[PDB]
Amino acid sequence: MIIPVRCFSCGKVVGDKWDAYLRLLEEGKQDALDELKLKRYCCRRMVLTHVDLIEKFLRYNP
Amino acid sequence: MNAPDRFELFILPDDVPKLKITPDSRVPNCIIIKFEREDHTLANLLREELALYPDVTFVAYKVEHPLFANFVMRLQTEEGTRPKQALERACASIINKLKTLDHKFNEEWNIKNF
């Protein structure tokens, strides 16, 4: 259901960071968050917990 | 549904003064100032700088209730010294302290490389 712009908790942006993350996994085989600059758990949990449904929604036709 | 429009936390509504000052009968030389569309950010800051003018005999402030962004400030001073003034002074002392701050943070900054 898409990535959440900015973390609820503190506010730091986080929209861009989605692809960077989902990438540092598939390839660089990796911590990811830490380098993506996601320090304190508030924003941490943001990314590390997103379940991107939009993908499946997108699998629908018209 | 029943919640106000956000912009009611800072904008004064139809005929309303930031300040309303009322004399206090409870004790001599005392007043209660109603600040409209404000909070601790500004309250506590004013409250503070008044226990600084050792010429102020009393100074506390409060937020009646959280739904409404307002707050009451009660002040009492020494003989023949009007608190309103002490409010001015203690209020001015505040700006200077910050005026200095702004400045001391700007020269400081420029000296940075990163």
């Binding site: 018209p62 | 300040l19 800051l45 309103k84 209020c91 505040i94 400081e108």
Partner: protein, 265 residues
Amino acid sequence: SKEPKVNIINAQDDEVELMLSDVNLSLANSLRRTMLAEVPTLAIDLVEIKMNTSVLADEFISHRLGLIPLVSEDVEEMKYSRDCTCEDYCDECSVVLELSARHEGETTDVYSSSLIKVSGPGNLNVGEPVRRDDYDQGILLCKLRNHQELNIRCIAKKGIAKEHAKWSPCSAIAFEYDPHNKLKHTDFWFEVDAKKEWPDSKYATWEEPPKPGEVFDYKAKPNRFYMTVETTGSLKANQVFSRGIKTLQEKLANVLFELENSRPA
């Protein structure tokens, strides 16, 4: 130079660690929150969707854009739509944007980079899709499939964090003081040893340790505060501190101004 004093520590573009000494906590804190909530910014506020085949709903995207960080450099030389004498909006108080997204590449993405600035910027830093992303398209608005279209039209306005979170440029702010509980503004929880069970802060090194032989100092007050001001973009980490320091001041001003307007009568 004069009263309170700063002593910046490692500082960058998205942060500004520094030590603020010779100030009353009361006043430190005040500035604290002022950054968090009352600095003028610029965010999308009105969205006029024309067509939208995305799987996301209208107001879902609408939300999204409200959060997308826009430029807010010369945000101060713009006016609040509420004060501008124009019915609704205009160049003198708003920034209009365009967004068109046709699914052609048989998953096409919609990044905040894809925003146009249809109104006249009047030559002032503002209204730009703050991008810090490595590639160059910060903030994925949303994805879309085959032939799904999507046409918008955004209108940005001044406003602050009070009015909405989509404004405040702060976004998290560190604050600590007297790492060695000397002022005893706390009573440590513990099972046997507080000191061993409770993490020592990286801030304990710019202040002297306790020293057993000394009795409890009482006349001492909360002086010096180790902070850190993170920014989301819109405004430069430095300004998100300056402007803060200043707005708080402007307020302290009218409290003195409003005062004057009440003496004549």
